[PDB]
Every structure is written in C-alpha cells, then in structure tokens.
Design an enzyme around this catalytic site. Structure first.
Site, short mmCIF file in Angstrom:
data_model
loop_
_atom_site.label_atom_id
_atom_site.label_comp_id
_atom_site.label_asym_id
_atom_site.label_seq_id
_atom_site.Cartn_x
_atom_site.Cartn_y
_atom_site.Cartn_z
CG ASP A 1 -1.64 1.29 1.49
OD1 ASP A 1 -1.61 2.17 0.57
OD2 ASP A 1 -2.09 1.49 2.63
CD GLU B 1 -3.34 4.65 2.00
OE1 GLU B 1 -3.13 5.86 1.97
OE2 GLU B 1 -2.92 3.89 2.93
CD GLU B 2 -6.35 7.66 -1.73
OE1 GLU B 2 -5.70 7.20 -2.76
OE2 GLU B 2 -5.96 8.64 -1.02
#
Ligand SMILES: Cn1c(=O)c2c(ncn2CCCC(=O)O)n(C)c1=O
Length: 501
Positions: free
Chosen positions: A275, A293-294
């Site tokens: 991540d 990441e999102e």
C-alpha cells in the site's frame, strides 16, 4: 514481445505455501483478540469475547458510539439511544438519511454537505437501484450498526505511535464498525493525529469519483449484511528502533520479477502487497483521494477500519494487515476509476481463518523539489521505512513471500521511479525477500529496472556497495548541481561508476 523480465513470477514465494505453521491464537499484552479462540472454526461466524459488552472510554481505546459515556445535551441524554431513534426510520429519499445522520451530529448540521449522497441516490442510480438501496441495503446496514454492543464486546486499543501491538478481530466485527462509520456514529472524531473514520466527507461535493466510491462500498455493505463473513483480520503496528548501517550491509541482492502488466492485488496474490500509503493510513479513501491506496481500501474495505485505531505513522513505523477480503473489481485508476462488479474472493484462509492476503502500509515522503530525494538523509529514510514494512522479526527467509510493489511515492509525492525501485530492491534484500515490481504500462521502466538489477547482481554488488553508489551520486551530481535536475541520470551514473572500476 516480452511483458515481464527477470525471475519468473511462478518461482517467487507465496502464501499460504511459503507460510510458517502458526502458533495458537491467544491474547497477550501485545495482541488483542476479540473473538473466542476456543470456538474458531472454518466456515462458522466467530463468537465475540467477552460475552457481554465491556466499555472503556479513555485516551487508549476506541470511544464506542454505544458507550454509556457517549452523551448529548437535552441534562445529559444517551447519544446511543438517540442514534437508534434516528436510524430506525424508513428512508425513501436521500434527505431522510441526511437528516437522520444529522440528529446525533447536530453541531455539524451546517458544516456537512451531503451533495454526493443526494446525487448518487437521485441522479446516478436507476429508480430500481435506489429502491433496493433504501428498502434493503440501508436498513440492513442500520441493523448491523445497531448490533455493535453484541458484536464488538471487547474494548479496542488504539494502535498509538511507538506501540508494537496487534489487534485480531472478525470480519463481522469490522462490518458492524464500518456501518457505524458510514452513519457517522463514532464520537469525538469530527471537530488530530488519527485519520477520519466517520464517512461524512464521502457524502460531500460533486466529484465524478464519489459515485464510484459509493458503488464500491455499497457492493461490500450488500455482501456482508446478506451473509456474515466468517474470517478474521489482524492489524499490526510495527516500530523498529534500530536500522541497518546501509553502507556496511554485506547482504546480496535478491531476485526480481518486473512487468508492465498486471496488478499488485491480482498478480501479487499471496505476496506482501504494498500500500503506497498516506501517513494517515487510507489517505483520501472516505474523502477526495482515488489512487493506489484509496483503491485498495475501497476494494478491500476491511482496510478502512484501520483508520478507527491507527495513529499517524512516524518515520520508523508501518501497519501490516493480514486477512482483508476483496469484495469488488474495478477498471481505470484515479479520475477514470470505475466500479465493475462484485468479486468472489478465492483466497485460502490460514490457520487463524485469515485470508492469505498480507498488505503493508508504508508512507513515502512528499518531495516538493525533485532533487531533495537524493539527499542521503532522505534516501536512508525511505530505505528504513520500506525495510520496516518488509521485515518480519523471528521468521526465516524461506518462509517470507516476495514483495509485490511498484512506483511507491511517485506521482503526487514527486518520487523518482528509478530511485524508488532501487530503494525497495535494497530494503527487500536486507529483509531477505524477493521483489515483484509492477510498472502499469511503462515498458521502458520495466526494461530499465531489469537491466540495472541484472547488472548489479552479475557483478555481485552488496546492499552496501549499491548504497555507496547512491551516496556518490548525491556527492558528485546532486549536492552542487546548478539546476532543477542533475547533469547525469542515476542509472547511467551507476553503470559508468561500476564499469569505471
Ligand atoms: C499503482 N497503479 C498505477 O500506477 C496504475 C494503475 N493503473 C494505471 N496506472 C498508471 C497511472 C495511470 C494514471 O496516472 O491515471 N493501477 C491499477 C495501479 O495500481
């Protein structure tokens, strides 16, 4: 022709096959376990421990919305009872949901915009999809939210800075907690070293991203309220006190597979999946961000609950999450991200009933000025961050999966891909792991990373030899460079420097 180079991916270690047989799951001072370990069985919903709800309301634990200490001005009233009252009404229009959420969030009644929620329900969904949302999904979500005191009976410790601590909890407990976050029920989380948990920023503004975020999260909510997931998830905060003296590190480099196709999450199954995190874990997931990441936190939403309890990461820390499940598939990336469909996760579960999916949140630095990242202090920082993320104290190398990663902190944060690739190769070597590296269409970077890696491996340079080369680059081309970029690029410099010798 060639879509990948280096060691075949088939030859890289994966879970569960590389895995150590696990020690028996049990609570200790550094491991909180919120289910009955004696009753954990494959295919069964875990039973909460303790049987009865226990409340802590202090600066070391999560402040639960169902706490008797969660009060509101009437005379104090029970904000939990008010929550139940507000959410146990029929919704038939998005304003009804907005007003319900505002009943126990009265102070935010002018601050919180619900435009994205309204536009999703009214202007994106078909009429039948809207009806299903308000007749089935939202009321199901309310019920799992309101079941919280029967589901999350054990206080949840904060993973605060400098703690080395794990929390192992059920996917079901997570589901309850996230439904609470959707309805913005977590107290004292709205008004500074913790991420946002309540989903209120998900509902604001008119970003074309918001409908895709919402569809992804509803896909999860529909799945986990229809049939409880049966597994566990562990969250570990990891803090190292000592870092390698990189210039002295005599270890050899490890193997590399590098490809311009595939994804971390699908092609890196069973591997340690990076991540590319914000220091506030999850970054913009329930606000405006939508990059690597999102995306991961949307398609594996159990990740999102890390934000309930994970303090902002310091330079020597990471967060390691084992067992999150993939509930959605997508297409695109960033401004072209779309939800495609529901995903049936095929991952095996380990002996703690965790999906054999291990993700590590490591935050890169943001480089305002491109050259800043070649400063020795900045290089060591990134090495040590990545090292912390990759190291598993008290595990042999043969039991360690390959690291599945890519251009960590490149894009918004201004990182150099060729530098960051080499940094990760060195961190990984030091942690005795192989590297699987994804360049997402960038075939020139695939060939370049490959050529550098084979070059250094064939001349058997160590971690320390390569790190000294990075220092030379700084000292000779960067430190007293007149311009925004230096005279000579990194890789060409390294080739000339070693071929010189
Ligand atoms: C980390 N990462 C990517 O970088 C990626 C991507 N797809 C295209 N890209 C390249 C960036 C495309 C864009 O900038 O909109 N995916 C799925 C990804 O995980």
């Amino acid at each position: 022709d060639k879509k990948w180079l280096g060691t075949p991916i088939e030859e890289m270690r994966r879970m569960p096959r590389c895995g150590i047989r696990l020690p028996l799951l049990r609570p200790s001072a550094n491991h909180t376990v919120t289910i009955r370990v004696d009753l954990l069985r494959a295919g069964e919903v875990p039973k909460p421990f303790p049987t009865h709800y226990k409340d802590l309301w202090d600066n070391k634990h999560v402040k639960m919305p169902c706490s008797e200490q969660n009060l509101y001005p009437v005379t104090a009233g029970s904000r939990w009872e008010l929550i139940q009252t507000a959410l146990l009404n029929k919704f038939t229009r998005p304003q009804n949901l907005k007003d319900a959420i505002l009943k126990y969030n009265v102070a935010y009644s002018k601050k919180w915009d619900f435009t994205a929620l309204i536009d999703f329900w009214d202007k994106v969904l078909e009429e039948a999809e809207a009806q299903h949302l308000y007749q089935s999904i939202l009321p199901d979500m309310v019920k799992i939210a309101l079941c919280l005191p029967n589901i999350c009976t054990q206080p949840i410790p904060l993973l605060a800075a400098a703690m080395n601590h794990s929390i192992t909890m059920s996917q079901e407990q997570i589901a309850s907690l996230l439904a609470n976050a959707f309805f913005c029920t977590f107290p004292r989380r709205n008004a500074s070293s913790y991420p946002d948990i309540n989903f209120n920023r998900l509902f604001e503004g008119r970003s074309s991203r918001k409908p895709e975020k919402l569809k992804t999260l509803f896909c999860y909510f529909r799945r986990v309220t229809a049939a409880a997931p049966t597994g566990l998830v562990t969250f570990t905060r990891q803090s190292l006190e000592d870092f390698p003296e990189w210039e002295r590190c005599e270890k050899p480099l490890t193997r590399l597979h590098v490809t311009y196709e595939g994804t971390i999450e699908e092609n890196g199954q069973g591997m340690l999946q990076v991540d590319f995190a914000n220091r506030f874990v999850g970054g913009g997931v329930t606000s405006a961000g939508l990059v690597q990441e999102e995306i991961r936190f949307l398609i594996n939403p159990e990740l999102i609950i890390s934000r309930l309890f994970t303090e902002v990461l310091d330079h020597n820390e990471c967060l390691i999450i084992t067992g999150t499940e993939q509930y959605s598939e997508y297409t695109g990336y960033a401004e072209t991200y779309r939800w495609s469909r529901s995903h049936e996760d095929g991952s095996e579960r380990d002996d703690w009933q965790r999906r054999c999916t291990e993700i590590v949140a490591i935050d890169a630095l943001h480089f305002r000025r491109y050259l800043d990242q070649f400063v020795p202090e900045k290089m060591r920082r990134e090495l040590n961050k990545a090292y912390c993320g990759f190291l598993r104290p008290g595990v042999s190398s043969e039991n360690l999966s390959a690291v599945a990663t890519g251009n960590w902190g490149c894009g918004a944060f201004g990182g150099d891909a060729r530098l960051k690739a080499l940094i990760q190769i060195l961190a990984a070597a030091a942690a005795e792991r192989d590297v699987v590296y994804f360049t997402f269409g960038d075939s020139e970077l695939m060939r370049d990373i490959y050529s550098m890696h084979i070059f250094l491996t064939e001349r058997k340079l160590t971690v320390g030899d390569v790190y000294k080369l990075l220092l030379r680059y700084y000292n000779e081309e960067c430190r007293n460079c007149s311009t925004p970029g230096p005279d000579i690029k990194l890789y060409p410099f390294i080739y000339h420097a070693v071929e010189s010798c």
